[PDB]
């Protein structure tokens, strides 16, 4: 967890989305105490190095910055939200909400595919992508 | 799925908050961050059951580290026990988790085995002198009575051996008969096999040399097949060793066939199929005459059972002597020597002092032979010889020389299928009473 | 069990044992552990309640033959005859005369240092066996003489201040509070070999602060059967001078210097030099 | 991570700048009153106290980066 | 240890003795001890004839062992758990091998084991869902059996089945056009026993029957052999044709291309049994080897019948997208292997990212042929959306 940095103001969130031109900006929105927001914080931290060349990761806490709760509508322990060139990206995991991510993904590998898929599709301006594995059943 | 992972994550964090407070003031802040690599390093060290120790490190630190590594190990191990039970039942889980859990259990099994082998040698002597002599003596009387003439060590000059070579090679190839994609070891193996076809005399010449010389080989790889109820050891071995052994196995059984040695009691299936063989056994029971009559308190007993952990108990030192009774000592010594080597699984290594791998091409032959020795121990000379018949004119699977010859003894029938023993006896009321009283 | 004219070699205590569970005047009702230690304790306590003072059960018992000299003197033989007394002695510095706690005890629980347990292995010579002996006379005074690493509080020393005509030791081989148990296998080297006239297994433990001099005479072993446990029992025989395992109706003689190569569990240690009071007191 | 360092906003709302798209009291208190009228740390913590002893020279001379695989 | 040293006794008091060799649970029964009265039991009953008196003296009741049932069950559990991303053919093919491994291994015994019948039904039912779930949407109302059972030659999946399945008579309807007009066909109005999917067990021959055939056939062969020796000649095969596929060793094994090497393959029945350690993959036909015994089952009649049930190309055509291609002859088309079309994928050396992404292509093609069956106003009860342009 101490690998991955944290964002302590909503102004750290916004500049961080802007200044990274060439890579995804992946953010976990959720709060330290949570059962499920700790688990994801692991599965990302392990992956963050492998992917440094196309994706950048950060951590944010709903309690630290609540400014973003209404606009993106944040419910539940945590939401993974992908950004490329200020454009909110979007993917269908078969789960019935195409915005963000909720459920906890299981393998390191299946997580890297999703990041890679989003980036590759995203690079072409495509706003939707399809997660190869569709965990509607899972979540 | 995330529980054990999460536990270790927070544990490390707690020590990190604690460590700066706890001590290591002299150590730099940058150095402290690496500390986590040693925690990882300690874990890495912990993994594979290898002692791990570094240079400049805190005492009031080493013990702390041990305490958290043990905590993670408990989490890890308990999870493994839980998931295996779910898998056995068929309970819905995870096909990833299915793979991860298997991985963790294979390391835990291997750790257990490595300690068991160590402890056997350290214990210093499972066999005992009285037992060893009993085993030896039994074998001697069997060989005496059976009248089989030892099987000579295979010659360069065997008409049969050249022909068998073909049979051995087919068996080895079968494993790659349908593979679209091969790895490097697979490619090497096939290359070797093609070379063997191209120049059989070199292949054969080298093989003979290996039997005569090489006493210490190279440990293979071990993996487990998950049958969701029991795990089965699968072995990966060097191709040169495998070809030589495959050939040898073909020879020996041909020699056994030609040279007899293995009685009709065993159930190899060379002549008869198992499902069908079971049926025949039922048919044989029906065929038994005077077998269903209970007018005077006659009783029949069917006993079924298994060897259990035969592999652990194989006597490398005993085995060699028993093989000398059968083959030229150079072959016996070769076979024995090939045995215990090194077993690897990632980080882990151990030396199989009393270990036999099922996955060898000629393992089957060894298992049948070793089982035969145990059959002599269990069966006894008086009835076992009656079942087998004389060495001049042996009986088939379920038959006797005469009705009198059957009647003479409680173990009228005897069947052995590798390690499975089947013995048929019918008791009179008086015989039954005797056994019960004793 | 002492009968010189037994019709068969061996005996069946199964009815005794079942009567000890079924016959409520013993609630022998222990389960989920049910060891040599627990049963020894349950037996000792029972005998002392059930032969007892004036009611023949504390005069014939023998309140000399041990003496957990602290408290209760019960059936005379097994409050003497199995108790010892450890006077623990809490201290502080300054002038704060911290306090002393005599305790009567029929069996002395040894620890056993810090065996990893939740750690896989090839164990022993490739994790820890040889130096087994974190253990010797381990404490060397228990908490009391040299290594008073007495974590609980300010200062300690744990003296064995009564020293009984036998002395049972029980090796802590493990913490049933957690799972099934990775035990504490760290081998417990006291096959003492020392008498001169030696190769005697001279056992002879002498108090390395005081003198009292005691000879090993029993030795429960744990064995690790893939089905329960097992518990075999090794007894001295002074007159042939031959140690004797028994192991489910089987009997076997054992080289007394090689006793320690089993997992020790319970030892009885007779006091000689009290047989210098009774070497002299014949 | 240069921005991570800096620490100062304009007195600025986060949503707007990027270009964002969304896809008596005393009496009450009195009334209320009239009505009123971890494991891991424990496991370790104990070790952490154990550490306190270690010297600052030893804290320094600690081997730094050992790989065993 | 006595649990696993279990002992059973057949005596006057007990109903029967018993043993358990390989995956079979066996019971041998004697009339003299006594019994009762019944009739032919098919798989349940085998007849032990006394060699000397030629009398049917006892019966052996074959039955499939519990452990082997668990292995089958777990195999099904596993194929699913593993196959998160594999194509449907890989799933089905694996299932086909697993089933004939057990079905071809036990054969007769299966019919007397009700537990297997329950298990088999449950596991097919579980199997259908995985493919259904792989499809778009989480709800299918019907999915008529034609799509699953139709042989892969006609673009189906070629699933073997033992479960009772209703081919609703509503789905047999088929319409063809001729320059004269448009003609329809429905056999639904014929009211008789309804149409059901073909069963492997019916095609299979009971063990008792096969044992009898092997005794007869091989004895006949031996006598013919003696005559051939006496007459100084070799058998021309036409002399044996009448028994060609008959016998437990399968007399046609006498004419295999590699006999001259297989002659030296001794101990093969253990080895095949012992093979399992050497290979990670575990196989369902452990008891036999085709070469060792030859072929023990005939695939074609069942396949042809499925086609008969399918109604042939015309029947296949309604379900299929074949008429849409305006190909003149059904026979002319040779279909295209996924692997064959796949070719480069075997050796494209790319980031798996292109693995399932290309393996779905065969599945995509399958959808087009059966889309009208797959997509209909009636079928799936879905909101109907017109496509863009």
Nearest to C167 by CA among C273, C246, C52, C58: C273
Breaks (C-N over 2.5 A) in chain E follow: none
Q: What angle do CA B380, B381, B382 make, to 5 degrees?
A: 100
Minimum distance, in Å, between the CA of residue E138 and any CA atom of chain A: 9
| Resolution of the structure, angstroms | 5.7
Cβ–Cβ < 8 Å for E102, E284? yes
Instruction: Pick C124's closest partner by Cβ from B74, B122, B124.
Output: B122
Minimal Cα distance from B47: which residue of C? C120
Long-range CB contacts (< 8 A, 24+ apart) of B123-129?
Answer: B123/C261, B124/C261, B126/B313, B126/B354, B127/B315, B127/B317, B127/B318
B415: enclosing H helix or E strand: strand B413-417
Cβ–Cβ < 8 Å for E280, B232? no
Nearest to A41 by CA among A3, A96, A88: A3
Residues found in chain E: 389
- Parallel, antiparallel or unpaired: strands C108-110 and C155-162: unpaired
Q: Quote the tokens at residue C245.
A: 């395992």
Minimal Cα distance from B68: which residue of C? C118
Q: Which residues, in sequence order, are CB contacts of B11 under 8 Å at separation 6+?
A: B68, B71, B72, D40, D44
Minimum distance, in Å, between the CA of residue E155 and any CA atom of chain A: 25
Instruction: Pick C125's closest partner by Cβ from B77, B112, B118.
Output: B118
**How many angstroms separate the CA atoms of E34 and E251, rounded?**
38
Nearest to B366 by CA among B306, B310, B304: B310
Minimal Cα distance from B34: which residue of A? A3
Nearest to B397 by CA among B278, B266, B270, B288: B266
**How many angstroms separate the CA atoms of C110 and C167, rounded?**
12
CA atoms within 13 A on the CB side of A21: 0
Do chains D and A touch by CB distance (3+ pairs < 8 Å)? yes
Minimal Cα distance from B96: which residue of A? A107
Contact residues, chain B, for A35 at CB < 8 Å: 6
Minimum distance, in Å, between the CA of residue B352 and any CA atom of chain C: 11
Q: Does E230 touch chain A (CB under 8 A)?
A: no
Cβ–Cβ < 8 Å for C51, C82? no
List all residues of chain A from 16 to 35 with a beta carbon under 8 Å from chain B: 35
Nearest to B414 by CA among B422, B425, B405: B422
Q: Mapped to the 3 state alphabet, what secondary structure does chain E carry?
A: CCCCCCEECCCCCCCCCCECCCCEEECEEECCCCCCCCCCCHHHCEEEECCCCCCEEEEECCEECHHHHHHHHHHHHHHHHHCCCCCHHHHHHHHHHHHHHHHHHHCCHHHHCHHHHHHHHHHHHHHHHHHHHHCCCCCCCCCCCHHHHCCHHHCCCCCCCCCCCECCHHHHCEEEEECCEEEEECCCCCCCCCCECCCHHHHCCCHHHHHHHHHHHHHHHHHHHHHHHHCCCCCCCCCCHHHCCCCCCCHHHHHCCCHHHHCCCCCHHHHHHHHHHHCCCCCCCCCCCHHHHCCCCCHHHHHHHHHHHHCHHHHHHHHCCHHHHCCCCCCCCCCCCHHHHHCCCCCCCCCHHHCHHHHHHHHHHHHHHHHHHHCCCCCCCCCCCCCCC
Q: Which residues face E166 on adjacent strands? A: E196
Give the C-alpha distances (Å, rounded to integers) separating D43 from A11, B7, B15, C179, D53. 39, 12, 11, 17, 19
Cβ–Cβ < 8 Å for C30, C42? yes
Contact residues, chain B, for E293 at CB < 8 Å: 273
Q: Does E82 touch chain B (CB under 8 A)?
A: yes
**How many angstroms separate the CA atoms of B354 and B315, rounded?**
7
* CA dihedral sign of residues C145, C151, C153, C154: positive
Please report the domains of chain A, with CATH numbers, ordered by start residue: 2-136 (3.40.30.10)
Asked if the Cβ–Cβ distance from B111 to C127 is below 8 Å, we say: no
Nearest to D61 by CA among B24, B66, B61: B24
Helix/strand/coil for A58: strand
Contact residues, chain B, for C124 at CB < 8 Å: 115, 118-119, 122
Q: Quote the tokens at residue B78.
A: 């308990």
Q: Does B2 touch chain A (CB under 8 A)?
A: yes
Minimum distance, in Å, between the CA of residue E346 and any CA atom of chain A: 20
Q: Which subunits sit against D, judged by 3+ Cβ pairs under 8 A?
A: A, B
C123-141: burial string, b at 16+ Cβ within 10 Å, e else: bbebbbbeebebbeebbeb
* CA dihedral sign of residues B223, B226, B227, B229: positive
Distance in Å from the first CA to the final CA of chain B: 56
The sheet that has A24-30: what strands, in order across it? A55-60, A24-30, A78-84, A87-88
Asked if the Cβ–Cβ distance from B9 to A104 is below 8 Å, we say: no
Helix/strand/coil for C214: strand
Helix/strand/coil for B293: coil
Minimal Cα distance from A69: which residue of D? D22
Q: What angle do CA B354, B358, B360 make, to 5 degrees?
A: 105
List all residues of chain D from 16 to 55 with a beta carbon under 8 Å from chain B: 40-41, 43-45, 47-55
Q: Which residues face E185 on adjacent strands? A: E174
Cβ–Cβ < 8 Å for B54, D63? yes
CB atoms within 10 A of CB C24: 8
Contact residues, chain B, for A110 at CB < 8 Å: 96
- Parallel, antiparallel or unpaired: strands C230-235 and C213-223: antiparallel
Asked if the Cβ–Cβ distance from E82 to B279 is below 8 Å, we say: no
Q: Find the radius of gyration of the CA atoms of chain B.
A: 28
Cβ–Cβ < 8 Å for B60, B22? yes
Mutate to test the interface with B, among E8, E16, E26, E287 (most CBs of B within 10 A): E26
Contact residues, chain B, for C126 at CB < 8 Å: 51, 114, 118
**How many angstroms separate the CA atoms of B333 and B311, rounded?**
19
Minimal Cα distance from D5: which residue of A? A12
Q: Does C120 touch chain B (CB under 8 A)?
A: yes
**How many angstroms separate the CA atoms of C179 and A77, rounded?**
33
Nearest to E76 by CA among E124, E22, E132: E124
List all residues of chain A from 107 to 136 with a beta carbon under 8 Å from chain E: 113, 116-117, 132-133, 136
Distance in Å from the first CA to the final CA of chain E: 75
Cβ–Cβ < 8 Å for C231, C220? yes
Q: Does A34 touch chain E (CB under 8 A)?
A: no
**How many angstroms separate the CA atoms of B275 and E25, rounded?**
9
Do chains C and B touch by CB distance (3+ pairs < 8 Å)? yes
Give the C-alpha distances (Å, rounded to integers) separating A3 from B6, B16, B37. 15, 13, 12
Cβ–Cβ < 8 Å for E105, E288? yes
Do chains E and B touch by CB distance (3+ pairs < 8 Å)? yes
Report chain A residues touching chain D, CB-CB < 8 A.
5, 7, 9-19, 65, 67-68, 70-73, 86, 88, 99
CB atoms within 10 A of CB C179: 13
The DSSP string of B129-157 is HHHHHHHHHHHHHHHHHH----PPPPPS-
Cβ–Cβ < 8 Å for B133, B321? no
Cβ–Cβ < 8 Å for E362, E335? no
Nearest to B398 by CA among B263, B306, B254: B263
Q: Quote the tokens at residue B389.
A: 């018949």
- Parallel, antiparallel or unpaired: strands C108-110 and C166-171: parallel
**How many angstroms separate the CA atoms of C82 and C87, rounded?**
16
State CA A92 to chain mean position distance. 14
Minimal Cα distance from E357: which residue of A? A132
Residues found in chain A: 139
**How many angstroms separate the CA atoms of B280 and B154, rounded?**
36
**How many angstroms separate the CA atoms of C207 and C141, rounded?**
8
Measure the CA dihedral C130/C136/C140/C141, to 10°: 120
Mutate to test the interface with B, among D51, D56, D61, D65 (most CBs of B within 10 A): D51
Q: Does B97 touch chain A (CB under 8 A)?
A: yes
Q: Does B287 touch chain E (CB under 8 A)?
A: yes
CB atoms within 10 A of CB E329: 7
Nearest to B357 by CA among B253, B250, B252, B235: B235
């Amino acid at each position: 967890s101490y690998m991955l940095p944290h964002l302590h103001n909503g102004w750290q969130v916004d500049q961080a989305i802007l200044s990274e031109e060439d890579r995804v900006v992946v953010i976990r929105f959720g709060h330290d105490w949570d059962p499920t927001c700790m688990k994801m914080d692991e599965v990302l931290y392990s992956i963050a190095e492998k992917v440094k060349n196309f994706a950048v990761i950060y951590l944010v806490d709903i309690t630290e910055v609540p400014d973003f709760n209404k606009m993106y509508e944040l419910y539940d322990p945590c939401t993974v939200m992908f950004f490329f060139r200020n454009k909110h990206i979007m993917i269908d995991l078969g789960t019935g909400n195409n915005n963000k991510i909720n459920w906890a993904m299981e393998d390191k590998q299946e997580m890297v595919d999703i990041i890679e898929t989003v980036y590759r599709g995203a690079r072409k301006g495509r706003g939707l992508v399809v997660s190869p594995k569709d965990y509607s059943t899972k979540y | 799925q995330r529980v054990e992972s999460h536990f270790d994550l927070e544990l490390r964090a707690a020590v990190m908050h604690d460590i700066l407070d706890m001590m290591p003031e002299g150590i730099k802040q940058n150095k402290a961050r690496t500390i986590l690599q040693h925690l990882s390093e300690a874990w890495r060290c912990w993994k594979a059951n290898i002692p791990w120790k570094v240079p400049g490190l805190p005492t009031p630190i080493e013990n702390m580290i041990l305490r958290y590594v043990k905590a993670k190990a408990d989490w890890w191990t308990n999870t493994a026990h839980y998931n295996r039970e779910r898998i056995r039942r068929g309970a819905t889980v995870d096909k990833t988790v299915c793979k991860k859990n298997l991985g963790r259990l294979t390391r835990l099994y291997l750790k257990a085995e490595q300690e068991r082998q160590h402890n056997y040698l350290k214990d210093g002597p499972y066999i005992t002198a009285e037992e060893a002599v009993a085993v030896y003596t039994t074998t001697v009387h069997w060989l005496e009575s059976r009248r089989f003439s030892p099987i000579p060590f295979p010659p360069l000059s065997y008409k049969h051996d050249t022909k068998l070579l073909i049979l051995a090679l087919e068996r080895l190839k079968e494993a790659y008969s349908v593979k679209s994609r091969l790895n490097q070891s697979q490619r090497e193996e096939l290359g070797l096999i093609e070379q063997a076809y191209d120049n059989p005399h070199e292949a054969l010449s080298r093989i003979k040399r290996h039997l005569l010389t090489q006493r210490a080989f190279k440990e293979v790889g071990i993996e487990f097949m998950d049958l969701y109820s029991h795990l089965v050891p699968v072995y990966d071995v060097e191709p040169l060793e495998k070809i030589t052994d495959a050939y040898l196995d073909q020879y020996l059984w041909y020699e056994a066939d030609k040279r007899r040695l293995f009685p009709p009691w065993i159930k190899p299936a060379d002549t008869e199929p198992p499902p069908l063989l079971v049926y025949k056994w039922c048919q044989g029971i029906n065929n038994l005459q005077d077998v269903w009559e209970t007018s005077e308190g006659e009783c029949n007993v069917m006993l079924e059972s298994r060897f259990e952990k035969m592999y652990e108990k194989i006597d490398l030192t005993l085995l060699n002597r028993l093989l000398r009774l059968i083959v030229d000592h150079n072959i016996a010594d070769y076979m024995t020597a090939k045995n215990n080597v090194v077993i690897n699984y990632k980080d882990m290594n151990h030396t199989n002092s009393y270990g036999i791998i099922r996955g060898l091409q000629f393992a089957s032959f060894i298992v049948q032979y070793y089982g035969l020795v145990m059959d002599l121990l269990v069966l006894g000379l008086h009835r076992a010889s009656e079942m087998a018949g004389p060495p001049q004119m042996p009986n088939d699977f379920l038959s006797f020389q005469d009705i009198a010859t059957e009647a003479a003894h409680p173990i009228r029938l005897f069947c052995r299928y590798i390690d499975r023993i089947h013995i048929f006896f019918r008791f009179t009321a008086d015989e039954a009473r005797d056994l019960i009283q004793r | 069990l002492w009968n010189p004219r037994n019709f068969k070699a061996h005996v069946s205590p199964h009815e005794m044992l079942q009567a000890v569970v079924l016959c409520s005047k013993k609630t022998f009702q222990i389960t989920k552990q049910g060891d040599g230690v627990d049963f020894l304790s349950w037996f000792l306590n029972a005998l002392h309640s059930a032969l007892g003072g004036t009611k023949k059960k504390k005069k014939t018992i023998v309140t000399d033959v041990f003496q957990g000299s602290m408290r209760i003197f019960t059936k005379k033989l097994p409050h003497p005859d199995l108790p010892a007394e450890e006077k623990e002695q809490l201290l502080h510095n300054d002038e704060y005369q911290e306090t002393m706690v005599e305790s009567t005890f029929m069996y002395l629980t040894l620890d056993l240092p810090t065996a990893p347990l939740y750690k896989d292995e090839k164990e022993q010579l490739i994790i820890p066996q040889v130096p087994l002996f974190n253990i010797l006379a381990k404490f060397n005074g228990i908490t009391e003489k040299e290594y008073k690493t007495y974590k609980e509080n300010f200062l300690k020393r744990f003296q064995l201040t009564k020293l009984p005509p036998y002395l049972i030791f029980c090796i802590k081989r493990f913490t049933k509070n957690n799972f099934f148990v990775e035990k504490n296998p760290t081998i417990v080297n006291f096959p003492i070999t020392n008498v001169d006239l030696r190769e005697y297994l001279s056992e002879e433990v002498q108090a390395v602060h005081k003198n009292t001099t005691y000879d090993l005479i029993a030795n429960i072993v744990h064995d690790g059967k893939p089905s329960e446990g097992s518990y075999r029992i090794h007894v001295l025989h002074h007159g042939t001078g031959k140690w004797y395992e028994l192991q489910d109706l089987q009997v076997t003689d054992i080289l007394p210097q090689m006793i320690t190569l089993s997992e020790a569990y319970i030892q009885i240690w007779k006091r000689r030099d009290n047989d210098e009071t009774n070497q002299q007191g014949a | 991570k240069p921005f991570l360092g800096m620490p100062a906003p304009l007195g600025y709302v986060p949503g707007l700048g990027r270009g964002a798209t969304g896809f008596l009291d005393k009496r009450m208190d009195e009334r209320r009153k009239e009505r009123r009228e971890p494991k891991i740390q424990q496991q370790f913590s104990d070790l952490k106290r154990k550490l306190a002893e270690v010297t600052e020279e030893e804290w320094l001379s600690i081997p730094e980066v050992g790989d065993a695989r | 240890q006595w649990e696993n040293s279990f002992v059973s006794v057949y005596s006057k008091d007990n109903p029967n003795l018993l043993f358990n060799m390989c995956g079979f649970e066996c019971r041998i029964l004697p009339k003299c001890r006594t019994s009762y009265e019944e009739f032919t039991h098919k798989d349940g009953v085998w007849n032990l004839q006394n060699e000397v008196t030629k009398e049917r003296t006892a019966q052996c009741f074959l039955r499939v062992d519990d452990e082997s049932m668990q292995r089958f069950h777990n195999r099904v559990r596993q194929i699913l758990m593993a196959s998160g991303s594999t194509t449907f053919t890989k799933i089905v093919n694996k299932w086909n091998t697993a089933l004939i491994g057990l079905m071809t291994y036990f054969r007769e015994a299966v019919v007397n084991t009700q537990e297997l019948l329950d298990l088999l039904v449950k596991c097919e039912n579980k199997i259908q869902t995985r493919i259904k779930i792989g499809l778009n949407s989480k709800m299918p109302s019907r999915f008529p059996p034609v799509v699953f059972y139709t042989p892969k030659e006609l673009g189906g999946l070629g699933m073997l089945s033992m479960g009772h399945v209703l081919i609703p008579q509503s789905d047999l309807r088929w319409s063809k056009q001729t320059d004269v007009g448009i003609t329809h066909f429905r056999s639904g109005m014929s009211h008789e026993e309804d149409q059901l999917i073909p069963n492997l067990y019916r095609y299979i021959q009971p063990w008792e029957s096969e044992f009898i055939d092997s005794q007869r056939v091989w004895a006949e062969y031996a006598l013919k052999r003696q005559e051939a020796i006496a007459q100084n000649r070799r058998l021309t095969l036409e002399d044996l044709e009448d028994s060609w596929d008959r016998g437990i060793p399968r007399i046609n094994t006498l004419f295999q291309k590699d006999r001259h090497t297989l002659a030296y393959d001794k101990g093969w029945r253990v080895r095949t049994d012992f093979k399992q350690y050497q290979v990670l993959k575990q196989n369902p036909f452990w008891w036999t080897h085709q070469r060792h015994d030859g072929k023990l089952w005939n695939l074609n009649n069942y396949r042809t019948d499925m086609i008969q049930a399918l109604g042939g190309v015309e029947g296949i055509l309604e379900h299929t997208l074949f008429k849409g291609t305006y190909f003149p002859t059904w026979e002319g088309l040779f279909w295209e292997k996924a692997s064959g079309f796949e070719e480069s994928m075997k050796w494209k050396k790319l980031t798996n990212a292109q693995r399932s992404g290309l393996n779905q292509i065969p599945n995509r093609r399958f959808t087009l042929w059966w889309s009208p069956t797959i997509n209909r106003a009636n079928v799936y009860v879905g909101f109907q959306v017109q496509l863009d342009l």
